[PDB]
């Protein structure tokens, strides 16, 4: 589990969004596994605006942060998981590491702040939903 908290925004995996996230929806995209909902309190987090290919993610299934290299966000075939069928996901970054379904929502960070959230796993990769393209997360 987990989310990004930037301004009056809460960024979560679409597949883990609550009734309340949907009830206060801002934006959502199933191709990205992303949902954004409005928040009453303001958030501690800063979004990266950059093309860094190195950073650190939280792995909740190892209670550990791991430094990774990762591909630029792209349109990737992900095999079938407990929360999705085998499908094309867009704006996805892949690194070599550990990701179980429960690890979705853990942060990936670089020197510029939050890059994305764990969204895929299996066959020794960890996939992350890029949010660096979402410039509207920074104001309003
Ligand atoms: C509920 N969201 C559905 C969805 C939105 C956008 C796309 C894409 F951009 F890829 F065309 C695919 C699926
Ligand atoms: Zn960066």
Domain boundaries, the chain: 3-44, 45-140
Which residues, in sequence order, are CB contacts of 18 under 8 Å at separation 6+? none
3-state secondary structure at position 44: coil
Which residues, in sequence order, are CB contacts of 105 under 8 Å at separation 6+? 1, 2, 3, 12, 13, 16, 117, 118
Q: Is 50 annotated as a binding residue?
A: yes
Residues tagged active-site: 15, 33, 104
Q: What is the CA radius of gyration of the chain?
A: 14
Tell me the structure's resolution in angstroms, rounded to a single decimal.
Answer: 1.8
Which residue, chain included where needed, has tokens 């792209």? 74
For ligand 2, a single-atom ion, which residues have Cβ within 5 Å?
48, 50, 52, 110, 112
**Contact criterion met (CB below 8 Å) for 62 and 100:** no
The residue nearest atom 5 of ligand 1, judged by CA position, is 29
Q: Which experiment gave this structure? A: X-ray
- Give the number of the ligand closest to the Cα of residue 25: 1
53, containing H or E segment:
none
* Ligand 1 atom nearest residue 29's Cα: 2
């Amino acid at each position: 589990s987990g989310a990004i908290y930037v301004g009056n925004y809460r960024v979560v995996n679409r597949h883990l969004a609550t009734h309340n996230d949907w009830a206060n929806l801002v934006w959502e995209d199933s191709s990205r596994d992303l949902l954004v909902s409005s928040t009453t309190a303001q958030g501690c987090d800063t979004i990266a605006r950059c093309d860094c290919q190195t950073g650190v993610y939280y792995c909740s299934s190892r209670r550990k942060h791991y430094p990774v290299s990762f591909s630029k966000p792209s349109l990737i075939f992900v095999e079938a998981s407990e929360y999705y069928p085998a499908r094309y996901q867009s704006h996805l970054m892949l690194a070599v590491g550990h990701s179980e379904p429960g690890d979705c929502g853990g942060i990936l960070r670089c020197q510029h702040g939050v890059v994305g959230i764990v969204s895929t796993g299996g066959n020794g990769l960890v996939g992350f939903a890029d949010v660096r393209d979402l410039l509207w997360l920074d104001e309003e």
